[PDB]
Design a protein around this ligand. Sequence first.
Ligand SMILES: Nc1nc2c(ncn2[C@@H]2O[C@H](COP(=O)(O)OP(=O)(O)OP(=O)(O)O)[C@@H](O)[C@H]2O)c(=O)[nH]1
Ligand SMILES: Nc1nc2c(ncn2[C@@H]2O[C@H](COP(=O)(O)OP(=O)(O)OP(=O)(O)O)[C@@H](O)[C@H]2O)c(=O)[nH]1
Ligand SMILES: Nc1nc2c(ncn2[C@@H]2O[C@H](COP(=O)(O)OP(=O)(O)OP(=O)(O)O)[C@@H](O)[C@H]2O)c(=O)[nH]1
Ligand SMILES: Nc1nc2c(ncn2[C@@H]2O[C@H](COP(=O)(O)OP(=O)(O)OP(=O)(O)O)[C@@H](O)[C@H]2O)c(=O)[nH]1
Ligand SMILES: Nc1nc2c(ncn2[C@@H]2O[C@H](COP(=O)(O)OP(=O)(O)OP(=O)(O)O)[C@@H](O)[C@H]2O)c(=O)[nH]1
Ligand SMILES: Nc1nc2c(ncn2[C@@H]2O[C@H](COP(=O)(O)OP(=O)(O)OP(=O)(O)O)[C@@H](O)[C@H]2O)c(=O)[nH]1
Ligand SMILES: [Mg+2]
Ligand SMILES: [Mg+2]
Ligand SMILES: [Mg+2]
Ligand SMILES: [Mg+2]
Ligand SMILES: [Mg+2]
Ligand SMILES: [Mg+2]
Ligand SMILES: [Mg+2]
Ligand SMILES: [Mg+2]
Ligand SMILES: [Mg+2]
Ligand SMILES: [Mg+2]
Ligand SMILES: [Mg+2]
Lengths: 208, 210, 218, 210
Amino acid sequence: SIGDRMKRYENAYRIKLPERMPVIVRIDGAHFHTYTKGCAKPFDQDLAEAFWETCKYLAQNIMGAKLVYHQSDEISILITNYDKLTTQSWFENNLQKIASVSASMATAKFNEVMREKYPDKPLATFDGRAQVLPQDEVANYFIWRQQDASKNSISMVAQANFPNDLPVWQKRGICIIKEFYLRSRWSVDHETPIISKDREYVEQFVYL
Amino acid sequence: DSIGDRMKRYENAYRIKLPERMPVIVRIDGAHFHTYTKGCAKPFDQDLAEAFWETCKYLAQNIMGAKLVYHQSDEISILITNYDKLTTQSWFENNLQKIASVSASMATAKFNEVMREKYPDKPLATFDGRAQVLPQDEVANYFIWRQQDASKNSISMVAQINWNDLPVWQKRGICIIKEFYEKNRSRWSVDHETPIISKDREYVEQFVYL
Amino acid sequence: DSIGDRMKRYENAYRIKLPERMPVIVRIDGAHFHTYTKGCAKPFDQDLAEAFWETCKYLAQNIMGAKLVYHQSDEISILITNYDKLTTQSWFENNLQKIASVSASMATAKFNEVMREPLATFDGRAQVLPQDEVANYFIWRQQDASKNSISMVAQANLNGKDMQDKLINWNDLPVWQKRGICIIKEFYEKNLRSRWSVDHETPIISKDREYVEQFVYL
Amino acid sequence: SIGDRMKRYENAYRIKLPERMPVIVRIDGAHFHTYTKGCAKPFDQDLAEAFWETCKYLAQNIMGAKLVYHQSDEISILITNYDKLTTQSWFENNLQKIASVSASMATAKFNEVMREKYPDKPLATFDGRAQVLPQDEVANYFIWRQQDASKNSISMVAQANFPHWNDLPVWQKRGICIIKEFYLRSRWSVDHETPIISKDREYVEQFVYL
Ligand SMILES: Nc1nc2c(ncn2[C@@H]2O[C@H](COP(=O)(O)OP(=O)(O)OP(=O)(O)O)[C@@H](O)[C@H]2O)c(=O)[nH]1
Ligand SMILES: Nc1nc2c(ncn2[C@@H]2O[C@H](COP(=O)(O)OP(=O)(O)OP(=O)(O)O)[C@@H](O)[C@H]2O)c(=O)[nH]1
Ligand SMILES: Nc1nc2c(ncn2[C@@H]2O[C@H](COP(=O)(O)OP(=O)(O)OP(=O)(O)O)[C@@H](O)[C@H]2O)c(=O)[nH]1
Ligand SMILES: Nc1nc2c(ncn2[C@@H]2O[C@H](COP(=O)(O)OP(=O)(O)OP(=O)(O)O)[C@@H](O)[C@H]2O)c(=O)[nH]1
Ligand SMILES: Nc1nc2c(ncn2[C@@H]2O[C@H](COP(=O)(O)OP(=O)(O)OP(=O)(O)O)[C@@H](O)[C@H]2O)c(=O)[nH]1
Ligand SMILES: Nc1nc2c(ncn2[C@@H]2O[C@H](COP(=O)(O)OP(=O)(O)OP(=O)(O)O)[C@@H](O)[C@H]2O)c(=O)[nH]1
Ligand SMILES: [Mg+2]
Ligand SMILES: [Mg+2]
Ligand SMILES: [Mg+2]
Ligand SMILES: [Mg+2]
Ligand SMILES: [Mg+2]
Ligand SMILES: [Mg+2]
Ligand SMILES: [Mg+2]
Ligand SMILES: [Mg+2]
Ligand SMILES: [Mg+2]
Ligand SMILES: [Mg+2]
Ligand SMILES: [Mg+2]
């Protein structure tokens, strides 16, 4: 056949992550330094809330999503596929499919939320990447990301003053977690802890 | 720094790059469109395709190395070359995940924007993207394999009356190509006179063998 | 310099690395060993087996992070851990093509020196496993080892249980003829020394999972 | 079953090279700086002669092998798999299988040849890597290695007389090649008249462009 030939060229880059391992997917904004030219400083409230709604939507549509952390213009999502013994994988851990769909989902909701408040704003695009992490390295990832949060935070505030203790999401970002009330829901945790002081906040979704 | 170096190695473990100076094909297919096209008209919705055609142009405009964009059903195939000269650079330096995700993202934002207008309240449409490389002699055969699947889907959609009288886009899908016009220049435009590539192979190979 | 950078980009396109701090398994199967073992005894050749046992030792003595080397038929599996400490380095920095080739190269180098008393060649592949699957791997190889052994004895001269039922006691046969064999580091006294030994009393991993899990969990 | 799940982990690193494309395989000696301690300087005949035979054995067993180039302790091999429309790739372009069996092949033979003259010599080991190249670069690759071989040749010769030339044979100056020779029988022989590729581009491209 010729479909066998063409599909063969395709499969040469059909990469699959090994299963039963933590999966972290990061979605950073594409050229947001130009996109946030009209946004306010040091932090834009409307811009931050757009991510929060976007993070929920991602968590609501991604199989195995347990935790979503937001900062600056990036979104990181912890995905587990070893909850039970027969737990299925999202797209069978198809590397390209995970990175693209997540980016696509984060692109759809973010735009539709932003355009409601800003109908003249240009389209916003996102890049996505996937990776695996050993269990003992999952908490260290979000710590490393949160240390990047605070560093960027103090740099953004000091840039206004010359060339004390801001709110939570302005200091170390926030997370979107599962909440119970018996039904399940995702909600923005404004009381986000410093992960280095409360590692179990992440590890509760890692070791299970 | 120290902790960032360790984390980067895990990330770089799946930092795959496509080899340079080779034809690149990015296919962007719509996720769960069988559910999404519930309200759309059968067998051919002119507004459904027009939203794709507006997206195809958007993709070709922003994707570095874009030469041709063939549309069919719910999928979009983009041909990319990075060997136009010796100083030619690749899109995102041929980062596999980045090309696949940015493309699927660009396709998503433009499609929803067009569809939102004149259809208020429609559910969000999403896309998945994949990248690959092809030897020059196989590039034409890729589109033929795609143009053949189009006609297969076309006649099967008509069934569930002359088929050959139907428009070229309903029968064989429609490519979009950079057209040259005079004003005061280049311009991406939809080719409604899209030929049967199996017959006219140079229609695609013209961008391949540069 | 400039040209070299260009070529390297093509080469680096397939410089793939396994994620670190994760159990790495390397399997080395023989190439065309059906032809190679023509002069060898059936169902089992003692001289052919002992060569692998020396090869497994040679490998373990040289693979950085090697903890367990299981032998069976014409295959050689090796458990490699790189998370023993906090500053534990990875063999070749987990370069996939490298550890797959140097392994096969090593096994080739020794297996020919021993047997020279044609040429045998090998293939090598590497992968990572989650901690709770390492045990299941060697079990899978060991269970496969038994099936081949029962099917080999029955031959000269349907299901595996049916063949065992008919056929000369099979359980009377030694361990290596039954469920393959492992080689591990043993600690002995000759005055507190250490060496890689061929564990002739290799347990059924399905029964004794800790036999392998001791190398997976610190 | 458990067998299906286990093969799944394995398949996660069962990488395949794209087909209909030049495949270059490089085989380099592992820590030969130690192995060649007993060997002469700057150019050891018996060491190089062992590689020449190894290059024969490699080309005699690699499906699609066209050209083999020897330098220092490395061995490069050009592999095409598009000579015909039905040409099959070696090991179906399995990256790990190509890389490993190649190095295993080299190791098995190199130790056999070297043992004839040096029975006291320790075991030699090789590492193998595999890649693909667009046709434009195949000649360039071998030039890159050959220009590298020339640099080292001049420097190493300069080591013996001063601390810190064209009269020397070809292999001591710019390495050597192994091509299939026709005499109607065929055989892989050592081209002792191996040209400077940068001048004779067709010497390599003749296997590339078919
Ligand atoms: N004013 C304002 N700018 C922000 C805010 N959050 C993110 N940004 C902008 O987003 C950028 C984040 O860093 P990057 O993601 O590396 O910037 P980039 O130009 O998008 O680079 P790429 O991610 O590679 O596209 C910063 O430079 C800021 O200018 C915000 O809350 N307010
Ligand atoms: N009404 C209408 N439906 C279409 C049109 N084009 C494609 N479709 C629908 O899209 C489907 C194409 O098959 P798929 O691409 O596999 O549909 P899918 O649900 O997106 O499945 P995935 O490819 O896995 O994402 C067909 O079954 C059609 O029902 C169109 O032009 N008009
Ligand atoms: N220009 C350039 N040359 C390199 C680079 N890396 C290695 N080389 C040279 O290219 C030659 C090819 O031999 P290799 O075995 O691939 O080099 P290497 O440094 O050992 O690379 P590894 O074996 O993967 O560790 C070596 O002699 C190096 O000196 C590079 O990144 N850029
Ligand atoms: N007579 C005999 N043959 C053996 C013995 N051990 C292994 N073999 C041979 O080794 C083979 C093991 O299966 P494979 O590894 O698939 O054989 P292969 O020919 O190397 O196939 P590939 O691995 O794909 O190259 C059997 O077919 C046997 O013929 C032995 O102890 N005695
Ligand atoms: N359950 C299961 N078993 C498999 C599968 N593939 C291979 N096996 C068995 O597992 C054993 C592993 O041997 P391999 O080295 O992979 O031999 P192979 O099947 O030729 O694989 P390659 O040499 O890479 O082509 C084989 O003897 C097969 O009988 C699979 O997909 N599922
Ligand atoms: N005496 C002698 N030594 C040689 C000759 N050719 C190569 N060598 C040795 O082979 C070595 C090749 O160096 P590299 O390939 O860059 O690295 P390596 O020493 O093999 O170590 P690795 O590549 O990391 O395994 C040189 O350092 C030389 O010492 C030769 O003709 N005569
Ligand atoms: Mg980025
Ligand atoms: Mg950004
Ligand atoms: Mg950022
Ligand atoms: Mg679809
Ligand atoms: Mg489709
Ligand atoms: Mg076998
Ligand atoms: Mg096999
Ligand atoms: Mg074998
Ligand atoms: Mg090297
Ligand atoms: Mg070397
Ligand atoms: Mg070398």
